[PDB]
């Protein structure tokens, strides 16, 4: 059985399949009733644990235990035994859950299931965590004995290698593309001297294949600070009202005078707008003007179910287009002055 | 040959897949048992590399017989044997990419006999197979002689193709780590050089001396040097006249591939092994430690990337054969490449010496330093605009003082 599943890592490492066949055996060895797998990721500085395999049991198949990206459950690592394990970085064995301070019934209301005993451990690459494995619900004894805690560790030594290989392969993927974007942006930046509107259109267009997106947009800001004498007179004479909108951290007013947007699904359809209206499909949400007030890198995960901003639902395009994930960051020019937002 | 409960060799091999795979002990350990299973006398492992666009095979483990220890079968970097890709059975295996075996060497063709004199061995039988990463070959493993028979049968081929799965996995993860190790540095040097070339406008000499000083660590080399050519195409009228009238006979030296005189007016060199000593030498003499070998004045003409493997044994260039320092430091590897400036004109020559691991330069160290010089060649737009500004301003001042 071990020589098989080593014959399966010959080419195109299959993270999902081999771990499934390891778990189907580890569930039978321990006399447990269920098993699981949680993945680790970081969004805007905070860490969290998603779900990748749920309710694996000895006679199930791969199609009924693989969780797509939409039917997920995300746990911050200050809630539950999973969070406690991923924070302390040590094995945990819980004979009864009625006493442990760290426990959550959130996952028991959705699935209609009751848990009594728990056994979990992390999986480490150097000093980092990569995943967490659980062995809920033992069938014969009152709780897991002490002799199983060594079978667990000595049998997960093979799955540790596969998960480390997967994690390493993923890091090779995201560093190949960082060299290419820099090289092919320098190539089109050092061609000639030009104004700002043309550099950001030549350089953002020739790397559209490495960025794996469907739409992205760039907005430019005005750079004039002090007004003229013949414009400050009406304010001081009661003719008009003073400005009351948002202000860039160095005092300027926030108004966009150009918007370059790209569409990359179906048609290329590059566009330029000389003066954006009050409701463009980019400026309407309000994120590009909240980023300019205070320079922040923002990362929203479920856009249609958010409250601070307003990403109205219903397709913007005939083909059917719903925003689900958004990222936006400012552009600074070595003098700590914002110049645009992407 | 074996029994069924007797196959606990599988467990013995799995026991080492625990942590910190050194990628050298594991291969040795699997070979030391594959030697017993096949009933062979010797085994060996050749590794694959490419220099100058031409492939090569270099030995990494040699004479790994039964009941041997690791320290007497590991080949040092400077005691190797290098084979071209067309000579010998190893070359044939690498070209065809399929397992082969010869019942008798003497009758068979393209069997070389170079090693049989150095190592005084007879090599009556050979059986070899390659290991692939998918469209690419990563190493070759060979077995020589048989313990008590005519030749290897088919059952031995079955045994080898069964027990090679534990090495196809070890050798492939040792290859990915190298690619990751090179991509990281290629990203970092571009980012950090872009930090320093966008800080201020200035002349060419300062820009190169601020962009090459920041990346000492990422290029693990002992010494490297950069030389700058002169860009004066055509001289004035009062300098041509002495030639056309019968004095100062005309120039005789070399010329760039667009017509010019090869003259180095500035040379920058860095020393990073003993103690950091950055120097700048204007109008260098023709016996400076970089210009004596004649390599940087040969790259400027042809414009070819040149890679040399064993300098004290090369005949065409005549390097030095004695230490150049109080401590014993001698040249062993060299790599040189030109710098172009968006109009296919050569503007300088860069040279790197003595990689810090004892091993020669290869493909993954050619691409990195080719990208570095491409970026440096593209970045010469800024120093020209400095001159254009410093001329426009003065011309404006003169014409504004004429109206007063």
């Amino acid at each position: 059985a071990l020589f098989e599943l080593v014959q399966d890592m010959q080419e195109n490492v299959n993270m999902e399949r081999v771990v499934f066949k390891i778990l189907r055996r580890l569930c039978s060895i321990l006399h447990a009733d269920r098993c699981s797998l949680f993945m680790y990721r970081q969004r805007n500085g905070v860490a969290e644990l998603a779900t990748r395999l749920f309710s694996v049991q000895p006679d199930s198949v791969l199609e009924d235990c693989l969780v797509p990206p939409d039917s997920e459950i995300v746990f911050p690592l200050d809630i539950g035994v999973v969070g406690h394990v991923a924070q302390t970085k040590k094995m945990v064995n819980v004979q009864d859950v009625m006493e442990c301070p760290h426990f959550s019934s959130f996952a028991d209301e959705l699935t209609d299931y009751v848990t009594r005993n728990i056994l979990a451990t992390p999986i480490m690459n150097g000093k980092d965590v990569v995943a967490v494995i659980m062995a809920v619900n033992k069938l014969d004894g009152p709780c897991f004995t002490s002799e199983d805690e060594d079978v667990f560790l000595k049998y997960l030594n093979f799955g540790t290698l596969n998960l480390k290989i997967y994690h390493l392969s993923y890091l090779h993927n995201c560093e190949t593309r960082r060299g290419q974007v820099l090289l092919w942006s320098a190539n089109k930046v050092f061609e000639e001297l030009t104004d700002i509107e043309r550099q950001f259109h030549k350089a953002f267009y020739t790397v559209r294949a490495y960025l794996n997106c469907d739409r992205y947009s760039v907005g430019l800001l005005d750079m004039t600070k002090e007004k003229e004498f013949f414009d400050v007179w009406p304010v001081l004479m009661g003719e008009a009202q003073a400005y009351s909108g948002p202000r860039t951290p160095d005092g300027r007013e926030i108004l966009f005078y150009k918007v370059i947007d790209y569409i990359l699904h179906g048609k290329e359809d590059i566009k330029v707008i000389p003066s954006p209206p009050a409701d463009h499909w980019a400026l309407a949400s309000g994120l590009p003007t909240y980023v300019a007030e205070s320079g922040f890198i923002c990362n929203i995960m479920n856009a249609p179910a958010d409250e601070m901003f307003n990403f109205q639902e219903g397709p913007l395009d005939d083909s059917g287009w719903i925003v689900k994930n958004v990222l936006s960051m400012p552009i600074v020019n070595k003098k700590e002055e914002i110049v645009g937002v992407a | 040959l074996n029994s069924v409960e007797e196959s606990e060799i599988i467990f013995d091999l799995l026991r080492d897949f625990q942590d910190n795979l050194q990628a050298e002990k594991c291969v040795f350990n699997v070979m030391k048992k594959l030697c017993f299973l096949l009933q062979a006398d010797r085994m060996s492992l050749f590794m694959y590399r490419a220099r100058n666009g031409i492939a090569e095979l270099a030995t990494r483990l040699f004479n790994v017989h039964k009941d041997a220890v690791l320290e007497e079968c590991l080949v040092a970097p400077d005691s190797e044997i290098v084979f071209p890709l067309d000579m010998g059975v190893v070359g044939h295996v690498a070209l065809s990419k399929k397992i082969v075996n010869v019942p008798n060497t003497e009758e068979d063709e393209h069997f070389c006999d170079f090693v049989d004199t150095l190592t005084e061995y007879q090599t009556k039988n050979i059986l070899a197979s390659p290991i692939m990463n998918g469209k690419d070959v990563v190493a070759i493993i060979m077995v020589v002689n048989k313990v008590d028979g005519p030749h290897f049968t088919e059952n031995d081929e079955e045994i080898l193709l069964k027990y090679l799965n534990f090495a196809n996995l070890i050798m492939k993860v040792f290859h990915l780590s190298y690619l990751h190790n090179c991509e990281t540095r290629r990203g970092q040097i571009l980012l950090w050089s872009g930090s320093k070339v966008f800080e201020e406008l200035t002349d060419i000499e300062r820009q190169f001396h601020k962009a090459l000083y920041t990346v000492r660590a990422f290029l693990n080399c002992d010494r490297y040097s950069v030389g700058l050519l002169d860009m004066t195409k055509q001289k004035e009228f009062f300098d041509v006249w002495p030639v056309l009238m019968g004095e100062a006979p005309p120039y005789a030296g070399p010329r760039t591939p667009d017509g010019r005189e090869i003259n180095f007016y500035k040379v920058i060199d860095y020393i990073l092994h003993g103690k950091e000593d950055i120097k700048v030498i204007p109008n260098p003499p023709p016996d400076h430690w970089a210009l004596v070998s004649g390599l940087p004045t040969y790259v400027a003409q042809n414009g070819l990337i040149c890679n040399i493997m064993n300098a004290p044994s090369e005949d065409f260039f005549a390097f030095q054969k004695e230490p150049l320092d109080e401590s014993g430091w001698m040249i062993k590897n060299v790599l040189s490449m030109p710098i172009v400036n968006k109009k296919e004109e050569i503007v300088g020559v860069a040279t790197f010496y003595n990689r810090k691991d004892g091993k020669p330069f290869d493909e993954m160290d050619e691409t990195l330093m080719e990208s570095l010089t491409q970026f440096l060649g593209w970045s010469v737009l800024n120093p020209d605009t400095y001159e254009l500004m410093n001329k426009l301003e003065n011309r404006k001042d003169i014409f504004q003082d004429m109206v007063k």
């Binding site: 794996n212 | 044997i81 998918g134 690619l179």
Partner: protein
């Protein structure tokens, strides 16, 4: 020092000849031919190993893949 190869002081070769030096690269075309063979570790990078941007523009009819002949 046996060294297992009986050689010390520098690498040795079976044959020697005049040196050959590599040539630069100028054109730097973007696209690549279609991919064949077994995959292996270290492939499937999105930006690389592809022609243009997407399949749909290359073959506009390919969108109607699931449909039968009659339509």
């Amino acid at each position: 020092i046996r060294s297992a190869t009986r050689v010390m002081g520098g690498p040795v070769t079976p044959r020697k000849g005049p040196p050959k030096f590599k040539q630069r690269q100028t054109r730097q075309f973007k696209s690549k031919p279609p991919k064949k063979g077994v995959q292996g570790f270290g492939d499937d990078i999105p930006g690389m190993e592809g022609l243009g941007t997407d399949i749909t523009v290359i073959c506009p009819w390919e969108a109607f893949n699931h449909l039968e002949l009659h339509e």
